[PDB]
Design a protein around this motif. Sequence first.
Motif, PDB file in Angstrom:
ATOM      1  N   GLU A  22      38.202  57.374  21.174  1.00 37.09           N
ATOM      2  CA  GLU A  22      38.233  58.114  19.923  1.00 37.09           C
ATOM      3  C   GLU A  22      37.603  59.500  19.838  1.00 37.09           C
ATOM      4  OE1 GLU A  22      37.835  56.031  16.143  1.00 37.09           O
ATOM      5  OE2 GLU A  22      37.810  54.147  17.278  1.00 37.09           O
ATOM      6  N   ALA A  42      35.539  63.978  12.559  1.00 40.01           N
ATOM      7  CA  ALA A  42      36.479  64.712  13.393  1.00 40.01           C
ATOM      8  C   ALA A  42      37.568  65.418  12.602  1.00 40.01           C
ATOM      9  CB  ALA A  42      37.106  63.771  14.423  1.00 40.01           C
ATOM     10  N   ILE A  81      43.322  71.113  17.472  1.00 47.53           N
ATOM     11  CA  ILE A  81      43.283  72.560  17.200  1.00 47.53           C
ATOM     12  C   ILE A  81      43.523  73.389  18.452  1.00 47.53           C
ATOM     13  CG2 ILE A  81      41.922  74.534  16.380  1.00 47.53           C
ATOM     14  CD1 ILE A  81      40.464  72.779  14.439  1.00 47.53           C
ATOM     15  N   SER A  99      46.657  75.422  18.270  1.00 44.41           N
ATOM     16  CA  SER A  99      47.499  76.468  17.702  1.00 44.41           C
ATOM     17  C   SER A  99      46.560  77.669  17.648  1.00 44.41           C
ATOM     18  CB  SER A  99      47.952  76.067  16.292  1.00 44.41           C
ATOM     19  OG  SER A  99      48.649  74.828  16.299  1.00 44.41           O
ATOM     20  N   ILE A 113      49.308  64.720  18.837  1.00 42.80           N
ATOM     21  CA  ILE A 113      48.079  63.989  18.577  1.00 42.80           C
ATOM     22  C   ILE A 113      48.371  62.615  17.985  1.00 42.80           C
ATOM     23  CG2 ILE A 113      45.718  64.125  17.690  1.00 42.80           C
ATOM     24  CD1 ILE A 113      45.957  67.028  17.322  1.00 42.80           C
ATOM     25  N   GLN A 114      49.507  62.453  17.303  1.00 43.01           N
ATOM     26  CA  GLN A 114      49.815  61.144  16.724  1.00 43.01           C
ATOM     27  C   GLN A 114      50.237  60.137  17.788  1.00 43.01           C
ATOM     28  OE1 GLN A 114      51.783  58.979  12.814  1.00 43.01           O
ATOM     29  NE2 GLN A 114      52.995  59.826  14.523  1.00 43.01           N
ATOM     30  N   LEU A 134      38.892  65.968  18.838  1.00 43.26           N
ATOM     31  CA  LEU A 134      38.294  66.946  17.950  1.00 43.26           C
ATOM     32  C   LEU A 134      38.771  68.091  18.866  1.00 43.26           C
ATOM     33  CD1 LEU A 134      34.521  65.951  17.151  1.00 43.26           C
ATOM     34  CD2 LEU A 134      36.101  66.926  15.456  1.00 43.26           C
ATOM     35  N   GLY A 193      47.196  74.485   8.518  1.00 47.19           N
ATOM     36  CA  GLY A 193      47.249  75.360   9.668  1.00 47.19           C
ATOM     37  C   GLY A 193      46.917  74.755  11.013  1.00 47.19           C
ATOM     38  N   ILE A 194      46.460  73.512  11.038  1.00 49.86           N
ATOM     39  CA  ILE A 194      46.137  72.894  12.318  1.00 49.86           C
ATOM     40  C   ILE A 194      47.414  72.897  13.165  1.00 49.86           C
ATOM     41  CG2 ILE A 194      45.395  70.799  13.509  1.00 49.86           C
ATOM     42  CD1 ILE A 194      44.517  71.812   9.890  1.00 49.86           C
ATOM     43  N   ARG A 250      36.194  68.517  10.993  1.00 55.01           N
ATOM     44  CA  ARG A 250      35.979  69.561  11.979  1.00 55.01           C
ATOM     45  C   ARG A 250      37.295  70.218  12.309  1.00 55.01           C
ATOM     46  NH1 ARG A 250      31.074  67.576  13.633  1.00 55.01           N
ATOM     47  NH2 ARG A 250      29.554  68.824  12.450  1.00 55.01           N
ATOM     48  N   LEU A 251      38.347  69.415  12.392  1.00 50.47           N
ATOM     49  CA  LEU A 251      39.653  69.966  12.715  1.00 50.47           C
ATOM     50  C   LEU A 251      40.142  70.857  11.583  1.00 50.47           C
ATOM     51  CD1 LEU A 251      41.462  69.271  15.309  1.00 50.47           C
ATOM     52  CD2 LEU A 251      42.942  68.129  13.668  1.00 50.47           C
ATOM     53  N   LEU A 296      44.006  51.986  19.159  1.00 49.82           N
ATOM     54  CA  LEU A 296      42.670  52.060  18.538  1.00 49.82           C
ATOM     55  C   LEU A 296      42.338  50.960  17.517  1.00 49.82           C
ATOM     56  CD1 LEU A 296      41.865  55.804  18.480  1.00 49.82           C
ATOM     57  CD2 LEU A 296      40.951  53.952  19.868  1.00 49.82           C
ATOM     58  N   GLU A 297      41.468  51.199  16.523  1.00 49.14           N
ATOM     59  CA  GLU A 297      41.135  50.098  15.594  1.00 49.14           C
ATOM     60  C   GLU A 297      40.160  50.273  14.419  1.00 49.14           C
ATOM     61  OE1 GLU A 297      41.026  46.805  18.484  1.00 49.14           O
ATOM     62  OE2 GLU A 297      40.436  45.521  16.795  1.00 49.14           O
ATOM     63  N   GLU A 345      49.527  57.476   8.308  1.00 49.75           N
ATOM     64  CA  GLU A 345      49.549  58.400   9.437  1.00 49.75           C
ATOM     65  C   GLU A 345      50.544  59.544   9.269  1.00 49.75           C
ATOM     66  OE1 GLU A 345      48.421  54.746  12.583  1.00 49.75           O
ATOM     67  OE2 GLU A 345      49.673  56.439  13.215  1.00 49.75           O
ATOM     68  N   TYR A 376      40.537  58.936  15.124  1.00 49.42           N
ATOM     69  CA  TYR A 376      40.983  58.951  13.734  1.00 49.42           C
ATOM     70  C   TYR A 376      40.610  57.648  13.013  1.00 49.42           C
ATOM     71  CZ  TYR A 376      44.350  57.485  10.129  1.00 49.42           C
ATOM     72  OH  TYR A 376      44.948  56.964   8.997  1.00 49.42           O
ATOM     73  N   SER A 377      40.733  56.525  13.712  1.00 50.13           N
ATOM     74  CA  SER A 377      40.423  55.237  13.115  1.00 50.13           C
ATOM     75  C   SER A 377      38.953  55.178  12.717  1.00 50.13           C
ATOM     76  CB  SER A 377      40.729  54.113  14.107  1.00 50.13           C
ATOM     77  OG  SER A 377      39.818  54.127  15.195  1.00 50.13           O
TER      78      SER A 377
END
Lengths: 975, 146, 49, 28
Positions: free
Chosen positions: B20, A849, B27, B29, B3-4, B24, A881-882, A852-853, B12-13, A873, A883-884
Amino acid sequence: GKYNLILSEYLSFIYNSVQIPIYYSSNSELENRCIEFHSKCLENSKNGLSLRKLFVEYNDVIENATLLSILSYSYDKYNAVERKLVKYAKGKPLEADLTVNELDYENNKMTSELFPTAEEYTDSLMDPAILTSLSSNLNAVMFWLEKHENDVAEKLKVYKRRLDLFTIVASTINKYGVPRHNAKYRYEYDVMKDKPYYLVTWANSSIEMLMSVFSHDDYLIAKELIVLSYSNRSTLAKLVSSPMSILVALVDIVPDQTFDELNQMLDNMRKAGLVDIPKMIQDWLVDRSIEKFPLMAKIYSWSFHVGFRKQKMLDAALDQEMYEYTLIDEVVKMLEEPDDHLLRDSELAGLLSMSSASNGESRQLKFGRKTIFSTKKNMHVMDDMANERYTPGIIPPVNVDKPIPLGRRDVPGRRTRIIFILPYEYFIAQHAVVEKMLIYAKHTREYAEFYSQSNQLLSYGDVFVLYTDVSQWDSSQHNTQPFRKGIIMGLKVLQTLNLYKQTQINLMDSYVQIPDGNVIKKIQYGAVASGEKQTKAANSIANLALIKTVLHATKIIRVDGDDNYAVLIQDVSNDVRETYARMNAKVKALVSVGIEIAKRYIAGGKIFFRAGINLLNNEKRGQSTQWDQAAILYSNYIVNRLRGFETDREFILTKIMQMTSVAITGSLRLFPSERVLTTNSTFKVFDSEDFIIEYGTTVDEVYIQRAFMSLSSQKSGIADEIAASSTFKNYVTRLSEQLLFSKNNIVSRGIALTEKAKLNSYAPISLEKRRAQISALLTMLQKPVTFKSSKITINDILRDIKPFFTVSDAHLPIQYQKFMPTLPDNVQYIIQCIGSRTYQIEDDGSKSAISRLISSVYKPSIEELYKVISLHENEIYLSLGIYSDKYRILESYVYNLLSINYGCYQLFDFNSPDLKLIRFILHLYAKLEVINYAIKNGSWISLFCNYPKSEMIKLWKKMWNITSLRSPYTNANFF
Amino acid sequence: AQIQKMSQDLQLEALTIQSETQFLTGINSQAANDCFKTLIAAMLSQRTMSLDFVTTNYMSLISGMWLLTVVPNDMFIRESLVACQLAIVNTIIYPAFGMQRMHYRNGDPQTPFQIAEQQIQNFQVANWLHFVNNNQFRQVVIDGVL
Amino acid sequence: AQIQKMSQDLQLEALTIQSETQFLTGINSQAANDCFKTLIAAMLSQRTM
Amino acid sequence: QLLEVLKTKEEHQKEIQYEILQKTIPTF
C-alpha cells in the motif's frame, strides 16, 4: 442535575412577585401527560391558585420525564439590583488617586471630565465588550452570597472573604448607582456622564476576581488588585507580573546583580501601592522552595484579571552598518527547492484561501439590485472581478497617497499594539510563499511553534539557559529596514516571486490612517506591524535571525513569537545585553534551570502556563451571540481551571443561566434546561461535569438529540440571494474554470457553501439569522413530535456499542510524576497513571496518501476526503489534475468529532500502555469510557467487549454516515 | 486508469497493509516530466543529485534498479548510492531469496553494493552486479571539434 | 561575503547533531583584531595562555 | 537538564577558588 435545581433558586431569588416548569419526553403517553400538566399549570397560576396538588398529580412527569426549560412570569422591572445592593453598600466608597496614570485618560476620572459633551464621549476606552450586564454580575454575586450566608467551617471563610471584598464593589457602585445597560450591552453617555469612567469594567474585573477566591491568599490578592486597579489602570498588571521572569531562575531542579534587578521589581511594586503581594514574593525568596512556588504562580496568573489596557489608538501607535543580521538566507532555504505548482498558481491558492484571510475596510458593495457594508476581503474580490476592477497584478501602494487603515490587539499588562489593514492584493501575493515557508518550518525544530504536530510539552522537555523578550524589537523602527531588505534580497513563479517583493517595497514607506478623536489624522510610520500573511511566519525568521546574530556549545536554539531562547552567568548576560544594545533594540535578555516566555514558564523543572483569561470583560466586540458568548465563557473558565485560576463553578452556572435565557414577552423569560444546554448539539454550552463529555444514552437524550439537529441550520434571506447575482456565479465559475476539467460539482458544491458559511458574518445576515433563530427556538421547546430522522451521528453510533461492553473494577497505580502542578487533582490523576503526550492527533486527514496526491492546489477538508473516500473506485475526482487510506480518513474524521485534540483530552496519552484496561471505534469508545470514569471517580474500570460478528456489519454501515454539530465555542484547545 | 489496475494486480484490503505505500507515487503528469528532464540535464551539466525515499516503499526501490542500471553511479553522491544499494541488498534480495541468515551487517567505506557481487551465486543475478558495479562513463574526446 | 562562500564550501547541515557551534565564529571584524593584539602582547609581556 | 544546573553550581566552586588565588596576586 444540580444545575437544573440551582436554577430554581436563582429564579426564586430574583423574582418575588410564578414558575411553570416544562417537561418533554420520548414516551408518547407521558408526553400527553406532560402537556396536561403544563396546561393546568398556566391556568392555576393565571388564576392565583396553588400548584402543590398539581405536582403531586404529575409525579410521573417530574420523576420520569425530562425538564425542557422553566418559564417565568414576572411583573416588576428587573431593578431589584438597586434594592439588593444597598444592604452591601455599608463600606466606604473608593476614591481613585487620579495622579497615577502617565496618560491622562488612563486615570479613572469622572466621565463628564474626560468627555464634557455627548458627541465627545466614547466607551471605546472601557467597553467590557461582553454581552452580559454589570447588574447581572451584581445580581449573580448577590445570589451566591444569599445562598452561602450560612455555610460553616472553611466554606464560611470563603464567604467572609467574598462578603468583605464584594462590599468594596457594592459600596463604590452604590455611591454612583448601578449603571444601566442598553440592548447592545453598551454603556451610553448619560448613564456614564456622572460616574467614574472606568467603573463598569472595573466592577466586572473585581467581580470576576472576588468570585475566584478561596484561600486566604486569594483574598489578599483579589483584595490588593481589586483596590489598586480602581485608580491604577496602566501598570498594575505589568508590575505584578514582571518579577516572575526573574523568579524562575531562582529555583533548582544566580549572580548578585540579578538579585538587585529583582529587588527593583519589588520596590517598583511597593512604590506603586502594593503591600501584601510584594511581601509574599519576599517570603518566598527566603527559601525559594518549588514546594511553595504555587503561590508565585497564582500571582502571575491573577495579575491578568485586572482588565484590558485599552488606550487611544494614537497613543498606542506613538510608542514606535551592524545589520550579519539581515541570515534573514533563511528565506531562501524555505523556498530553494520549490517550479512548484503552488508557486506557479499562487494566485488561485491565495484566492481560495481568502476564507482564512485577514480583514480589510468595510467597503460598499452592490450585488444584483442592493447594497451592503461587507468587511470581508473575499467578497471584495467578488465585487472587483464582476467590475473589471479586480487587478492583483497591481498591488495598491501603501503610502501617503493610499495609506493603511488600522486595527488593534489588546492584552492585559502590555502597551497596545497596532494592526495594519492592507487590501486583498497583499494576502494573495503572500499566501503561497508563506505556505511554502511554513512547510520548511514544519520540519525544522528551531521554530518551536511549527515543528510537526508538536505540543507545548515537547518544547518544555527540550529545555540538556538564556531567554529573551524581543517583543519590542519586532516593532523597532530599526528593524524594518533589515527585515524588509532580507526578505526582498532572498526573493508564473517569477511573477509570484516578484509580486511578493513589491509588498515589501510598498511597506518600506508606509503611512498610517491613525485616528485622533472624531477626526482621522494621518501620520507616517517607520516601524513594522502585523497584518500580512508573512507576519507570524516572517516574524519568526527575523527573531531566529536575531538570536543567531547575538549568540566565551549551542545545544538548542528556538523561537516562539516574541521570545527566543538557547541552551549553551553575570558576564554572559552582560555581554548578551550589551550586544542587544549595540543593535539598538529594546529587549529583556535574561539568563539562568528555568525560563519564562509569553506562552509558558518553566520554574523548578516543572512546566507552567499562565491562567489569566478575563471572563467578565472581553477584548473586542466580535459577532458572536449571547448564547455563543456563554459557551465561550464556559470554555474560558475550563481553560483557567486547568491552568490555575479557578472561578467558582456556581458563578459560571449563574452566568449561563442569565446569558442563555430568552424572553418571549415583556414579562416572561424562558430559561433553557440543563438537558437542553449540555446535550451534545449545535447549541451545547457546557458539560454537567467539567472535563467530562456525555452522549445520549437514554431514549430522551436521543429523542431530543435528533430533534435539535432539525432547526440547526436555518436559511438566511440574504445568503441565498447573494449567490443569485452574476457576481457570485462569475466568481465561483471564474475560480473553478482554472481548477476543473471534468464534472467537478462535488468540488463545486462545496466552494459555494464555503462562502455561504462565512457570509452570515455580515451583520444583516448574522443578525437576521440570530433573531429568526429565536422564533424557531422558542417554538421548538413548545411542541416537536414530528421529525423525519434518518441521519446518524456519533451519539447514535456510540449508543449502539454501549450494550456490548462489560465493565469491571480494575486498578491502576500512580507512576508518572508531576510536571504541570496546576492541573486539578482529578485531571492530574489521569496523567499520573497513564501519562501524557507531546503530540497532536492527526484530525484532518492531512497525513493520507490521497490527500498528498491531491496536493492540484485545491485543499478538500476532512469532510470532503471522508465523503470522497466513501465512494466507488470508478468515481474516485483526481478533475483536479492528478488506497484501502480509507481507514485513515475515517480515523481523522472520528477524532475530530471527539475533540480528542482540544479540551483536557489533548493532555492524555490515549495510547498509554497503562490505559491494558481495555479488552477502532470499540477501542476508542473503550478508552474514553475508562478515562471519563477515572475523572469522575478516581478509580479505574476495565472493559470487555464481545461484539458479535453480525453486529459489526450493521455498525460498519453507520460509520460512513455520521453528520456534525458546528458549535465552535467549545474550543478549549489552549496548548 | 493505471493506478487503479495497480491496486488490483496486488489484492489489497482492511488494516492488512503490504504494498500500500507504493502509490503516493502516482502524480506523474508532473513527476515523469520532472524525472525525465531532471535526469538528462543532470548528465549534461554533469551535476550530482541526492535521493529521497522511504524503506517501506519497496516498489520505489525496484525502479531504482532501473535507474542504477543506467547512470554510471558515479553520477550520484556517495552517501546516496550507499543507502540505496544496502537498502536493496538488505530488504529486497535476501528476505525472499532464502539468503537472509545475516540481514547484512555494514560499516561504511569500500563499496557496499559491490561486495554483494563476490557474495552469493546465481548467474542472472551475477551479471547485473558486474555490469552495474563496474559500469562507468566512457571518457571521449573529439566530436567534430574538441 | 566570506562566511557565505563558507557555507557553499562547508556543507553546514549534513546530518551531524551539534550545528551552529562552529559558526559562533562571527564578530570576526573584531575577533581578528583581538586575536592579533592578544597574541603579540602575550609574547612580549612574556605571558602564557 | 542536569548538565546546566551544574555549570552554575560549578561556577561558584570554580569561582570562589579561582579567586582565593587572585588574593595571592597583587594585581589591581
